Amino acid sequence: GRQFGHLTRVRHVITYSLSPFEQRAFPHYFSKGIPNVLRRTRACILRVAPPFVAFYLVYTWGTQEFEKSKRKNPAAYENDR
Amino acid sequence: IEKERDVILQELQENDTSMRDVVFNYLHATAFQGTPLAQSVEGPSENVRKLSRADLTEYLSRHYKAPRMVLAAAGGLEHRQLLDLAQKHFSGLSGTYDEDAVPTLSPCRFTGSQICHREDGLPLAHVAIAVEGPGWAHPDNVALQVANAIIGHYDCTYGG
């Protein structure tokens, strides 16, 4: 019904909070957060990056593979005959 | 000591029945966290078990000397016929004044915050709201009396 009223039934949870003025917008932002970078940046990086690396090779790989194929005619047949 | 403790442990667990007296203490701890002011009168269930009457006598000792003590009475009595039979106990038994610090109190912290205990069983939710205010003695102490006189109050069965 009324969006919040009839949502669900919940029992014996307790919540604790302050006015925003009670605290600061940078509670050791640098110091505390900078480590957190790794645990997330390491978490997925196992799962994600490598496929692209393969691509990047192909990028140069085929290009190079392309390049000779045309660029030099006096290659397979040199200009002799 | 054990009788009362059990009686109190009886009560402490029974005191959970009236949501009214419940919600108050939350509010104290809400702002007045950091000072003893916010704490329960009856305190943690554990000290109820954990108390030796030494601390009692000790707390009997400290705070029951004067100026802490204040005595009065009212009725057909005037003053003199009191003061005569006031006199010697409790002229007196002292009831003292030495130090026991002085008079120790501290400014209590006033904290903008919230407390939420969500429980869906009961029919209704007691809710009250507050902001801190001046001390006992002050002119403003007067104006605030009429402040609440403005809003009035309503409940179910008033003939309002």
mmCIF file with all atom_site columns, N, CA, C and O in Angstrom, chain A residues 8-19 22, chain B residues 33 110-121:
data_model
loop_
_atom_site.group_PDB
_atom_site.id
_atom_site.type_symbol
_atom_site.label_atom_id
_atom_site.label_alt_id
_atom_site.label_comp_id
_atom_site.label_asym_id
_atom_site.label_entity_id
_atom_site.label_seq_id
_atom_site.pdbx_PDB_ins_code
_atom_site.Cartn_x
_atom_site.Cartn_y
_atom_site.Cartn_z
_atom_site.occupancy
_atom_site.B_iso_or_equiv
_atom_site.pdbx_formal_charge
_atom_site.auth_seq_id
_atom_site.auth_comp_id
_atom_site.auth_asym_id
_atom_site.auth_atom_id
_atom_site.pdbx_PDB_model_num
ATOM 1   N N  . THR A 1 8   ? 7.422  -4.762 4.579  1.00 0.00 ? 8   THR A N  1
ATOM 2   C CA . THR A 1 8   ? 7.816  -6.071 5.069  1.00 0.00 ? 8   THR A CA 1
ATOM 3   C C  . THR A 1 8   ? 7.592  -6.056 6.569  1.00 0.00 ? 8   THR A C  1
ATOM 4   O O  . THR A 1 8   ? 7.178  -5.047 7.137  1.00 0.00 ? 8   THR A O  1
ATOM 5   N N  . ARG A 1 9   ? 7.865  -7.180 7.208  1.00 0.00 ? 9   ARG A N  1
ATOM 6   C CA . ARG A 1 9   ? 7.904  -7.245 8.657  1.00 0.00 ? 9   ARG A CA 1
ATOM 7   C C  . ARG A 1 9   ? 9.337  -7.483 9.107  1.00 0.00 ? 9   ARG A C  1
ATOM 8   O O  . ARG A 1 9   ? 10.049 -8.305 8.528  1.00 0.00 ? 9   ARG A O  1
ATOM 9   N N  . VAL A 1 10  ? 9.761  -6.741 10.121 1.00 0.00 ? 10  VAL A N  1
ATOM 10  C CA . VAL A 1 10  ? 11.133 -6.755 10.594 1.00 0.00 ? 10  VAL A CA 1
ATOM 11  C C  . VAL A 1 10  ? 11.092 -6.666 12.105 1.00 0.00 ? 10  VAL A C  1
ATOM 12  O O  . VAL A 1 10  ? 10.219 -6.006 12.676 1.00 0.00 ? 10  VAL A O  1
ATOM 13  N N  . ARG A 1 11  ? 12.029 -7.336 12.764 1.00 0.00 ? 11  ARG A N  1
ATOM 14  C CA . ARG A 1 11  ? 11.978 -7.385 14.217 1.00 0.00 ? 11  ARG A CA 1
ATOM 15  C C  . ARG A 1 11  ? 13.357 -7.257 14.845 1.00 0.00 ? 11  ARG A C  1
ATOM 16  O O  . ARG A 1 11  ? 14.279 -7.997 14.499 1.00 0.00 ? 11  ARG A O  1
ATOM 17  N N  . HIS A 1 12  ? 13.473 -6.323 15.784 1.00 0.00 ? 12  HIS A N  1
ATOM 18  C CA . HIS A 1 12  ? 14.604 -6.253 16.699 1.00 0.00 ? 12  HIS A CA 1
ATOM 19  C C  . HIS A 1 12  ? 15.908 -5.956 15.971 1.00 0.00 ? 12  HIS A C  1
ATOM 20  O O  . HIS A 1 12  ? 16.923 -6.629 16.142 1.00 0.00 ? 12  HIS A O  1
ATOM 21  N N  . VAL A 1 13  ? 15.855 -4.921 15.145 1.00 0.00 ? 13  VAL A N  1
ATOM 22  C CA . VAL A 1 13  ? 17.017 -4.274 14.565 1.00 0.00 ? 13  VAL A CA 1
ATOM 23  C C  . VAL A 1 13  ? 17.156 -2.949 15.295 1.00 0.00 ? 13  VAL A C  1
ATOM 24  O O  . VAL A 1 13  ? 16.152 -2.385 15.746 1.00 0.00 ? 13  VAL A O  1
ATOM 25  N N  . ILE A 1 14  ? 18.374 -2.458 15.443 1.00 0.00 ? 14  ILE A N  1
ATOM 26  C CA . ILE A 1 14  ? 18.574 -1.156 16.061 1.00 0.00 ? 14  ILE A CA 1
ATOM 27  C C  . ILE A 1 14  ? 19.603 -0.371 15.265 1.00 0.00 ? 14  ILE A C  1
ATOM 28  O O  . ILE A 1 14  ? 20.562 -0.930 14.727 1.00 0.00 ? 14  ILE A O  1
ATOM 29  N N  . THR A 1 15  ? 19.403 0.943  15.187 1.00 0.00 ? 15  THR A N  1
ATOM 30  C CA . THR A 1 15  ? 20.206 1.812  14.342 1.00 0.00 ? 15  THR A CA 1
ATOM 31  C C  . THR A 1 15  ? 20.753 2.970  15.163 1.00 0.00 ? 15  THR A C  1
ATOM 32  O O  . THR A 1 15  ? 20.086 3.458  16.076 1.00 0.00 ? 15  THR A O  1
ATOM 33  N N  . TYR A 1 16  ? 21.965 3.413  14.831 1.00 0.00 ? 16  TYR A N  1
ATOM 34  C CA . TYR A 1 16  ? 22.658 4.463  15.564 1.00 0.00 ? 16  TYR A CA 1
ATOM 35  C C  . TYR A 1 16  ? 23.279 5.447  14.585 1.00 0.00 ? 16  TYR A C  1
ATOM 36  O O  . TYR A 1 16  ? 24.015 5.040  13.681 1.00 0.00 ? 16  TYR A O  1
ATOM 37  N N  . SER A 1 17  ? 22.994 6.739  14.762 1.00 0.00 ? 17  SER A N  1
ATOM 38  C CA . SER A 1 17  ? 23.514 7.741  13.840 1.00 0.00 ? 17  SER A CA 1
ATOM 39  C C  . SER A 1 17  ? 23.512 9.114  14.494 1.00 0.00 ? 17  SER A C  1
ATOM 40  O O  . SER A 1 17  ? 22.875 9.334  15.523 1.00 0.00 ? 17  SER A O  1
ATOM 41  N N  . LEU A 1 18  ? 24.217 10.039 13.847 1.00 0.00 ? 18  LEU A N  1
ATOM 42  C CA . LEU A 1 18  ? 24.496 11.373 14.352 1.00 0.00 ? 18  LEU A CA 1
ATOM 43  C C  . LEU A 1 18  ? 23.972 12.422 13.387 1.00 0.00 ? 18  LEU A C  1
ATOM 44  O O  . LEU A 1 18  ? 23.684 12.134 12.225 1.00 0.00 ? 18  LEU A O  1
ATOM 45  N N  . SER A 1 19  ? 23.887 13.654 13.865 1.00 0.00 ? 19  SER A N  1
ATOM 46  C CA . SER A 1 19  ? 23.770 14.766 12.930 1.00 0.00 ? 19  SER A CA 1
ATOM 47  C C  . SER A 1 19  ? 24.987 14.803 12.017 1.00 0.00 ? 19  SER A C  1
ATOM 48  O O  . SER A 1 19  ? 26.085 14.420 12.437 1.00 0.00 ? 19  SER A O  1
ATOM 49  N N  . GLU A 1 22  ? 27.877 16.768 13.423 1.00 0.00 ? 22  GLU A N  1
ATOM 50  C CA . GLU A 1 22  ? 28.659 16.164 14.488 1.00 0.00 ? 22  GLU A CA 1
ATOM 51  C C  . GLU A 1 22  ? 30.021 15.710 13.992 1.00 0.00 ? 22  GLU A C  1
ATOM 52  O O  . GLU A 1 22  ? 30.953 15.547 14.786 1.00 0.00 ? 22  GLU A O  1
ATOM 53  N N  . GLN B 2 33  ? 25.235 11.068 25.631 1.00 0.00 ? 33  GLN B N  1
ATOM 54  C CA . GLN B 2 33  ? 26.368 10.177 25.510 1.00 0.00 ? 33  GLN B CA 1
ATOM 55  C C  . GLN B 2 33  ? 27.652 10.944 25.763 1.00 0.00 ? 33  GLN B C  1
ATOM 56  O O  . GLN B 2 33  ? 27.816 12.080 25.313 1.00 0.00 ? 33  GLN B O  1
ATOM 57  N N  . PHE B 2 110 ? 25.676 17.711 24.133 1.00 0.00 ? 110 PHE B N  1
ATOM 58  C CA . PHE B 2 110 ? 24.370 17.853 23.504 1.00 0.00 ? 110 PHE B CA 1
ATOM 59  C C  . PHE B 2 110 ? 24.523 17.439 22.052 1.00 0.00 ? 110 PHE B C  1
ATOM 60  O O  . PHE B 2 110 ? 25.054 18.208 21.245 1.00 0.00 ? 110 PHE B O  1
ATOM 61  N N  . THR B 2 111 ? 24.034 16.266 21.699 1.00 0.00 ? 111 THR B N  1
ATOM 62  C CA . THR B 2 111 ? 24.471 15.641 20.458 1.00 0.00 ? 111 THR B CA 1
ATOM 63  C C  . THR B 2 111 ? 23.290 15.478 19.516 1.00 0.00 ? 111 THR B C  1
ATOM 64  O O  . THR B 2 111 ? 22.337 14.753 19.827 1.00 0.00 ? 111 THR B O  1
ATOM 65  N N  . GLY B 2 112 ? 23.349 16.151 18.368 1.00 0.00 ? 112 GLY B N  1
ATOM 66  C CA . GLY B 2 112 ? 22.386 15.904 17.308 1.00 0.00 ? 112 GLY B CA 1
ATOM 67  C C  . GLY B 2 112 ? 22.595 14.528 16.702 1.00 0.00 ? 112 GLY B C  1
ATOM 68  O O  . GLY B 2 112 ? 23.669 14.244 16.143 1.00 0.00 ? 112 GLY B O  1
ATOM 69  N N  . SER B 2 113 ? 21.580 13.679 16.768 1.00 0.00 ? 113 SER B N  1
ATOM 70  C CA . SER B 2 113 ? 21.731 12.276 16.411 1.00 0.00 ? 113 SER B CA 1
ATOM 71  C C  . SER B 2 113 ? 20.351 11.643 16.361 1.00 0.00 ? 113 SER B C  1
ATOM 72  O O  . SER B 2 113 ? 19.330 12.334 16.410 1.00 0.00 ? 113 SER B O  1
ATOM 73  N N  . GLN B 2 114 ? 20.325 10.321 16.252 1.00 0.00 ? 114 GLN B N  1
ATOM 74  C CA . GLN B 2 114 ? 19.086 9.574  16.141 1.00 0.00 ? 114 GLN B CA 1
ATOM 75  C C  . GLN B 2 114 ? 19.241 8.247  16.856 1.00 0.00 ? 114 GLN B C  1
ATOM 76  O O  . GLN B 2 114 ? 20.357 7.772  17.073 1.00 0.00 ? 114 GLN B O  1
ATOM 77  N N  . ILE B 2 115 ? 18.115 7.658  17.239 1.00 0.00 ? 115 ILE B N  1
ATOM 78  C CA . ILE B 2 115 ? 18.109 6.272  17.672 1.00 0.00 ? 115 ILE B CA 1
ATOM 79  C C  . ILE B 2 115 ? 16.858 5.611  17.122 1.00 0.00 ? 115 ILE B C  1
ATOM 80  O O  . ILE B 2 115 ? 15.763 6.173  17.190 1.00 0.00 ? 115 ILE B O  1
ATOM 81  N N  . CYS B 2 116 ? 17.030 4.429  16.533 1.00 0.00 ? 116 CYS B N  1
ATOM 82  C CA . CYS B 2 116 ? 15.922 3.694  15.932 1.00 0.00 ? 116 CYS B CA 1
ATOM 83  C C  . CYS B 2 116 ? 16.006 2.232  16.337 1.00 0.00 ? 116 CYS B C  1
ATOM 84  O O  . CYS B 2 116 ? 16.977 1.552  15.997 1.00 0.00 ? 116 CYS B O  1
ATOM 85  N N  . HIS B 2 117 ? 14.997 1.749  17.054 1.00 0.00 ? 117 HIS B N  1
ATOM 86  C CA . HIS B 2 117 ? 14.845 0.324  17.328 1.00 0.00 ? 117 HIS B CA 1
ATOM 87  C C  . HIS B 2 117 ? 13.567 -0.133 16.638 1.00 0.00 ? 117 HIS B C  1
ATOM 88  O O  . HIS B 2 117 ? 12.462 0.110  17.126 1.00 0.00 ? 117 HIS B O  1
ATOM 89  N N  . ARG B 2 118 ? 13.721 -0.840 15.535 1.00 0.00 ? 118 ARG B N  1
ATOM 90  C CA . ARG B 2 118 ? 12.603 -1.199 14.680 1.00 0.00 ? 118 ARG B CA 1
ATOM 91  C C  . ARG B 2 118 ? 12.068 -2.550 15.103 1.00 0.00 ? 118 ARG B C  1
ATOM 92  O O  . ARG B 2 118 ? 12.778 -3.553 15.032 1.00 0.00 ? 118 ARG B O  1
ATOM 93  N N  . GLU B 2 119 ? 10.819 -2.581 15.542 1.00 0.00 ? 119 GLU B N  1
ATOM 94  C CA . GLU B 2 119 ? 10.174 -3.840 15.870 1.00 0.00 ? 119 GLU B CA 1
ATOM 95  C C  . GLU B 2 119 ? 8.725  -3.759 15.427 1.00 0.00 ? 119 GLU B C  1
ATOM 96  O O  . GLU B 2 119 ? 8.015  -2.815 15.788 1.00 0.00 ? 119 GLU B O  1
ATOM 97  N N  . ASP B 2 120 ? 8.293  -4.750 14.651 1.00 0.00 ? 120 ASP B N  1
ATOM 98  C CA . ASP B 2 120 ? 7.040  -4.697 13.914 1.00 0.00 ? 120 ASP B CA 1
ATOM 99  C C  . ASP B 2 120 ? 5.877  -5.380 14.611 1.00 0.00 ? 120 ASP B C  1
ATOM 100 O O  . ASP B 2 120 ? 4.765  -5.355 14.080 1.00 0.00 ? 120 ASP B O  1
ATOM 101 N N  . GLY B 2 121 ? 6.090  -5.982 15.771 1.00 0.00 ? 121 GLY B N  1
ATOM 102 C CA . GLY B 2 121 ? 5.017  -6.711 16.418 1.00 0.00 ? 121 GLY B CA 1
ATOM 103 C C  . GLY B 2 121 ? 3.913  -5.849 16.998 1.00 0.00 ? 121 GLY B C  1
ATOM 104 O O  . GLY B 2 121 ? 2.734  -6.079 16.725 1.00 0.00 ? 121 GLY B O  1
#
